[PDB]
Design a binder for this molecule. Structure first.
Ligand SMILES: Cc1ccccc1-n1cc(C(=O)O)nn1
Ligand SMILES: [Zn+2]
Ligand SMILES: [Zn+2]
Ligand SMILES: [Zn+2]
Length: 585
């Protein structure tokens, strides 16, 4: 028994064909089963023919005779159908409303989540459907990883490199940091974990979360966890205030955080606020300075990845009393300079999926473009706070949609918070970039920020761009452009100062080849987010939809502090690059 996902009308009915099995009142349970392929219906018992040897599960072909359900061939003389009069039989038949259109709820439950339009509807629908779509999408993603085969150690060629044997019949998952395997050893009766691993083409290379003398017979599987149901909404009801509520500003603040005093008060005059922070604008500076401005405020700093949650710890280590902090870790290594697992410690730093159930004066959700509507609902479910601050940049990169292949996901569809920022604008906007040269800022400002991003540094005069298509070769699940890597090599022979540069590309296979031919550190654009390097050498590799993505190309050129070389394939972003042009040797 539970609340309907369409009309809230109390129900004792659940759809058996939906992987989340939402409670559906007789009206909505009916309009769903007759308009889709979903026919299995669950209540206290399953609506299935209780006759020996019968396989009828469709509720339209089932009748309730006595207290057991049968079909047309197995029903008693005294029976009435379970599915008629626009209602499926179940408790609370008098309390049943119905919706003007269930069509939105149907496409959510039937879609394979491989199209961009599936994620659009999952973000525009009613709030209760945003929660249901988040579970359905995430439970689908946790199940698709079971479709991938098992990799087994056929040979241990050396350290750091392996020879893998893959399962038959099932496909193989791509080998990049977006897929994180988990190993096992063949014990007596069952198996035991031996850390998490990531792989890449060589035989394959690996990188282990822990070090081991792993041997033949060990196997790796993408660990899929549970998808618990969502109760709280993605966003609490917004409440604007006339005074600062529940918070108390300081009389003495330092000149380091003085330019934020207006926004720190803005945080106290809203139930929740949004802060867009382009690269180099000082987002973690903002989040920690907010603590000094409201000194006695219990603040919970949170994000999805431990890396983002640890970057806040580094700044809290630089400004806040250490005995007032705590790092929450569930029983991969992370920041271990605060007392671990102390929920009653003023400043709490934790990931979303590990969040305890507690209250706080302020909550700081960092790097919000990575979040999903599932994460947003968990934060509101575990954390009941007075003010919610959402820090991020919807012009940066979103969470990887491992099923999405057709179409492109726009920033307003990343999550509910990014929808507000890209439509009604963000409550706050850090508009000065103190990291990149002027040519980079003057490029991403017009590209994704409506010319509202101001450069603090001057022109570095060391930003260059070349238009070289070259030769594109493909492999299993990545692309490789060696003539672009070769152009970089010929550039490096005439610019040996650019050998302290980081090589960045949209494809990790391009990084692997570039690591062998150039010897520069490698980062995919998605792995480079949140990090700054002096020099960056970027090869777009292709002009597919993946490499031309403006939120990716924004991150691709903003990691530079001094200079950058961009070997471009797409003419569009090549002309949008305000860089000194170079010719092809
Ligand atoms: C990077 C940045 C951009 C803008 C404003 C402040 C900062 N920042 C200063 C500090 C520090 O003093 O540690 N951290 N971050
Ligand atoms: Zn269904
Ligand atoms: Zn309903
Ligand atoms: Zn039957």
């Amino acid at each position: 028994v539970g609340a309907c996902v369409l009309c809230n009308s109390q129900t004792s009915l659940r759809c058996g064909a939906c992987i989340r099995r939402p409670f559906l009142c007789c009206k909505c349970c009916y309009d769903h089963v007759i308009s889709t392929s979903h026919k299995l219906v669950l209540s206290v018992n399953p609506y299935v023919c209780n006759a020996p040897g019968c396989d009828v599960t469709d509720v339209t072909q089932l009748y309730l005779g006595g207290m057991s359900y049968y079909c047309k061939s197995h029903k008693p003389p005294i029976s009435f159908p379970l599915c008629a009069n626009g209602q499926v039989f179940g408790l609370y038949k008098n309390t049943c409303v119905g919706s003007d259109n269930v069509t939105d709820f149907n496409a959510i439950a039937t879609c394979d989540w491989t199209n961009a339009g599936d994620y659009i509807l999952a973000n525009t629908c009613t709030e209760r459907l945003k929660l249901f779509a988040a579970e359905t999408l995430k439970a689908t993603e946790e199940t698709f990883k079971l479709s991938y085969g098992i990799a087994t150690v056929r040979e241990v060629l050396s350290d750091r490199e392996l020879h893998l044997s893959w399962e038959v019949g099932k496909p193989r998952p791509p080998l990049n940091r977006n897929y994180v395997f988990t190993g096992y050893r063949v014990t007596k009766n069952s198996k035991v974990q031996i850390g998490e691993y990531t792989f890449e083409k060589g035989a394959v290379v690996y990188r282990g979360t822990t070090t081991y003398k792993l041997n033949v017979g060990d196997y790796f599987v993408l660990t899929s966890h549970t998808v618990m149901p969502l109760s709280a909404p993605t966003l609490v009801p917004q409440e604007h205030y006339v005074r600062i509520t529940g918070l108390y500003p300081t009389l003495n603040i330092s000149d380091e955080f003085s330019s934020n005093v207006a926004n720190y008060q803005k945080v106290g005059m809203q139930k929740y606020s949004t802060l867009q922070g382009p690269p180099g604008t000082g987002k973690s500076h903002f989040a920690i300075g907010l603590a000094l401005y409201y000194p006695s405020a219990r603040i919970v700093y949170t994000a999805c990845s431990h890396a983002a949650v640890d970057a806040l710890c580094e700044k809290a280590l630089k400004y806040l009393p250490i005995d007032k902090c705590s790092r929450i870790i569930p029983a991969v290594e992370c920041f271990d300079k605060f007392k671990v697992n102390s929920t009653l410690e003023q400043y709490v730093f934790c990931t979303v999926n590990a969040l305890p159930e507690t209250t706080a004066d302020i909550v700081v959700f960092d790097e919000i473009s990575m979040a999903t509507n599932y994460d947003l609902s968990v934060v509101n479910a575990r954390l009941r706070a007075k003010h919610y601050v959402y820090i991020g940049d919807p012009a940066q990169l979103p969470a990887p949609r491992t099923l999405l292949t057709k179409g492109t996901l726009e920033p307003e569809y990343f999550n509910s918070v990014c929808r507000l920022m890209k439509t009604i604008g963000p409550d706050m906007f850090l508009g000065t970039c103190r990291r990149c040269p002027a040519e980079i800022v003057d490029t991403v400002s017009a590209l994704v920020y409506d010319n509202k991003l101001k450069a603090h540094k001057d022109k570095s005069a060391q930003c260059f761009k070349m238009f070289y298509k070259g030769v594109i070769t493909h492999d299993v699940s990545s692309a490789i452009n060696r003539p672009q890597i070769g152009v970089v090599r010929e550039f490096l022979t005439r610019n040996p100062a650019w050998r302290k540069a980081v090589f960045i590309s949209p494809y990790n296979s391009q990084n692997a080849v570039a690591s062998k031919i150039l010897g520069l550190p490698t980062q995919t654009v998605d792995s480079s987010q949140g990090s700054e390097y002096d020099y960056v050498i970027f090869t777009q590799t292709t002009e597919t939809a993946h490499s031309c993505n403006v939120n990716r190309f924004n991150v691709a050129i903003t990691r530079a502090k001094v200079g950058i070389l961009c070997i471009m394939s797409d003419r569009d972003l090549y002309d949008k690059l305000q860089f000194t042009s170079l010719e092809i040797p």
